Write a protein that binds this ligand. Structure first.
Ligand SMILES: Cc1cc2c3c(c1C)C(C)(C)CC=[N+]3c1c([nH]c(=O)[nH]c1=O)N2C[C@H](O)[C@H](O)[C@H](O)COP(=O)(O)O
Ligand SMILES: Cc1cc2c3c(c1C)C(C)(C)CC=[N+]3c1c([nH]c(=O)[nH]c1=O)N2C[C@H](O)[C@H](O)[C@H](O)COP(=O)(O)O
Ligand SMILES: [K+]
Ligand SMILES: [K+]
Ligand SMILES: [Mn+2]
Ligand SMILES: [Mn+2]
Lengths: 511, 510
């Protein structure tokens, strides 16, 4: 019935659509879960539900803890390849991505928001079973080693961190990676300018950065995990946008051991204290640009888990990032795209000319294509450098987009003949419409994205400055002549009369 | 059957392989031939042999002049997508392009060459029929208007110009586009630094520039039209190289109205005089980067046609350039890669490290990917900006490559984990391994390629300086640490042992 609000309805729709395979054969958390999911992503196969994982004998409740759903946001192979993404928002599964983005943009006006509603503990399935700190041992759960060279088992790849500011004015829901540190403990990334850091920075500012309450929620409402992955504004409570998107309040319940509220329908909730006063090793991970660099090591804060609540037969969703295409593309890039569309929308100049933006997956969410209406472009009476200075100041440096676009390294301005969602069209335009280096405006005083390989393995990690450009793929005269024409030399570029005769009668030609 | 030496054998082997579609229904040379060929390239369909072109009723011999063969160098839909390129050289049709290129490169040694052999006219099928000047009217032949906004009907898109230097030391076979100017005339591109220009320049040097003898041959031996598209060196005679590649001399015959030699197995030979001091309108054309710019306009020199020889039921092969992939990618791009690879083969530094080079068609032949052996790279005790200057200087400024590599505007240095022939792999490495701008080395004094749309519709068309860069997609430590380690996060990047999944896949999904 409602896959936006209920993880298990999400699973049931995929099963109904023929886009889910239950695997009853024993699969090993050590490396095979990741191989399978990867082969699923890459060939656009059905999402695998792993019912029979190889279990450690000391696991405290193996019949319940846990199965793995993989590829929850991976592309589908038969119809609309973005079905799984549409489904997270409870939309028609054939809703294509450009429209999925319009739906999110459409619902970004705060007047559409609906705050979550508290309900009693017996309306939540995950409140059926409990583990205290003493009983908890994360070492024994079937947490996968997703990639060779991963510095730990990454238990948190598709659940949601719930952190609240000390004054209670902002409750943030987001995704960030997490690996098992020891029996009772998870460490993961907590970096500028991510909200998990902003919010915890507040607890630090008040001298309580050792005992920051957190919940970590697995199998949350699919619309909730989608937004958990979207960079909505600083200070914004994700729950309220999720509500609008669902035209319905997210039902939530209070934790057992802190006063955070978590969704009624989760598979498993982990409760504890984020400890920003103790650093620990958090291991390299195979991430969104397609590498694991096994010798890359750094220290990160520690989440001390004191409690766990979980339902019968818990299912954990999982993301196993690498080459395109996967959740670190469809969700990290798609949702950057959606928020940047919204924000641009509200820009008095950029809203007149920008038709659409999208992060082509082929570029691992390092590029943002920006589709410009040339007719309205002429009216502005501008040029390549000045439009590029405006765009990049806005996307790289504004208080609006400083964080939102932080992962992006190249912005690609193109005219409105190119469906930016079709990479054959984007790559044609990129190689044929910009002079190497000359039509790339370099911004040196911007914060680079530390995960970009070219930065992590280069000098940009030491310097922490620059690395970005805005590339204009719009011919000089497209800025001045509104009747500028070229014929695009493919079949679809022929005159309508010709295409129609040839297409209608193709069987007469190619018999 | 010899598809290297005989066009009709080439056609027969595609037929035999299921990669040919005889079209007997009437197709119009006005836009339709072009629209059908565009759909066939783009969907990698069988090559279309149009048996029934809509004829002007005044054509002097419509049963013979002419049929059209489309997509001769297009990609095939079923096995080795490059099978047509292989058969041009007479190779097994499943020969992959890397291996096609190795073959061309292996045979670049002048030792291996074999000059052509003169045979009597009664050995040439195209000597069966003849047209004198008074009889010729190019405007009644079913020449196609290939793209909307083309300035004229482009008759020459897969034929071979033959021009010989006054001193008869150098004879060049090449492709350059040519449209019909009038009932007796073709105008075509003759621009720097192409050999059509270098060789005709010589006549203008000698003051005899208005009467340069030429032949223009169609349906020439597929190995010859293939080399006709390869930038072999200045002053090198293509016939010799082609013979080497065919392990047989190309049978040639003498033109009727001049002393030029033309392949004996052609469909139609045109003969006449290239007039370098009569410049006429040579209207825009749908070109290799995907665009026809309808109000781009220049003038070009004139080929006056005085004689046509042809054979029963002449076939004209054609190329209808545009979006990837078509002959302006597999041939223009592939052979620039091939000649580049060989020339790099003779460089005392670059041959230690370069495994392959390729123009990915997705980049419309503006990009050259250069695959570098990492272990041998370390031994060079070098870094990004030094290697970039070296590589960029050689391809853009050396007497060896100034012309060869003229079409390329971005050279991309990648390590040897990247199969540079699989664009999925190349674009991964491009986007993720170079910092924009910091890792691009601009060259501002080199000659830009004037066809490139960012040039043609930009200042580079005027300034004729710059427009190019070398882009490093090799991590700094790849140059110093030989054991530099990273895991590729696709399926093929997991340990060989984790076979288990592949061999047992049906147990998971079944
Ligand atoms: C969907 C998704 C997004 C990842 C991501 C992953 C997924 C599956 C993983 C789990 C596979 C592994 C790593 N990723 C992290 C991440 N953000 C971050 O700070 N650290 C991360 O380690 N994100 C990006 C992050 O979720 C977005 O930037 C959100 O905007 C964060 O929320 P916020 O805007 O509330 O800070
Ligand atoms: C296969 C091929 C190659 C084209 C070509 C085409 C095809 C089908 C067309 C017919 C689609 C249209 C235009 N092209 C021209 C061209 N070179 C050139 O100088 N002017 C051209 O108009 N070439 C490239 C040219 O043939 C190569 O650069 C050769 O190296 C030139 O021979 P040369 O080295 O002896 O000068
Ligand atoms: K978020
Ligand atoms: K040539
Ligand atoms: Mn947030
Ligand atoms: Mn030549």
């Amino acid at each position: 019935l409602n896959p936006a609000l209920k993880f298990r309805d999400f699973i049931q729709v995929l099963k109904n659509e023929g886009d889910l395979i239950e695997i009853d054969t024993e699969v090993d958390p050590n490396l095979e879960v990741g191989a399978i999911t990867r082969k699923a992503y890459e060939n656009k196969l059905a999402a695998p539900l792993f019912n029979n994982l190889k279990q450690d004998p000391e696991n405290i409740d193996p019949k319940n803890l846990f199965r793995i759903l993989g590829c929850p946001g991976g592309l589908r192979g038969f119809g609309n390849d973005h079905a799984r993404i549409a489904l997270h928002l409870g939309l028609d599964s054939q809703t294509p991505m450009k429209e999925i983005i319009d739906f999110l943009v459409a619902n970004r006006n705060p007047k559409k928001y609906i705050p979550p509603v508290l309900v009693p503990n017996d309306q939540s399935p995950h409140k059926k079973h409990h583990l205290t700190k003493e009983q908890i041992d994360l070492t024994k759960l079937p947490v996968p080693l997703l990639h060779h060279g991963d510095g730990g088992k990454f238990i948190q790849t598709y659940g949601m961190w719930v952190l609240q500011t000390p004054d209670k004015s902002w409750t943030n829901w987001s995704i960030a990676r997490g690996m098992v540190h020891d029996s009772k403990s998870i460490t993961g990334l907590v970096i500028n300018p991510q909200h998990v850091k902003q919010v915890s920075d507040a607890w630090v500012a008040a001298g309580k950065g050792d005992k920051i309450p957190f919940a970590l929620c697995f199998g949350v409402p699919p619309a909730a995990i989608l937004v958990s992955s979207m960079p909505i504004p600083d200070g914004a409570t994700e729950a309220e946008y999720i509500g609008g998107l669902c035209n319905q309040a997210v039902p939530v319940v209070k934790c057992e051991t802190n006063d955070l509220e978590v969704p009624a329908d989760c598979e498993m909730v982990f409760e504890g204290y984020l400890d920003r006063d103790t650093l620990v090793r958090e291991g390299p991970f195979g991430e969104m640009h397609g590498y694991c660099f096994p010798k890359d090591h750094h220290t990160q804060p520690l989440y001390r888990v004191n409690h766990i609540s979980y339902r019968d037969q818990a299912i954990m969703p999982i993301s196993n990032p690498g080459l395109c295409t996967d959740e670190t593309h469809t969700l990290i890039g798609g949702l950057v795209s959606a928020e940047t569309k919204y924000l641009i929308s509200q820009h008095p100049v950029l809203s007149k000319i920008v038709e659409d933006v999208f992060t082509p997956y082929e570029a691992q969410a390092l590029w943002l294509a920006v589709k410009i209406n040339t007719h309205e472009l002429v009216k502005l009476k501008t040029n390549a450098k000045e439009l590029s200075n405006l765009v990049g100041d806005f996307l790289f440096r504004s208080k609006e987009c400083y964080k939102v676009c932080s992962i992006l390294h190249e912005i690609i301005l193109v005219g409105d003949d190119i469906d930016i969602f079709d990479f054959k069209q984007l790559i044609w335009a990129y190689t044929t419409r910009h002079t190497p280096v000359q039509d790339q405006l370099y911004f040196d005083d911007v914060k680079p994205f530390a995960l970009a390989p070219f930065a992590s393995q280069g000098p940009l990690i030491k310097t922490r400055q620059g690395g970005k450009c805005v590339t204009t793929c719009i011919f000089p005269k497209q800025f001045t002549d509104p009747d500028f024409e070229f014929v695009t030399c493919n079949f679809n570029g022929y005159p309508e009369e010709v295409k129609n005769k040839i297409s209608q009668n193709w069987d007469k030609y190619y018999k």
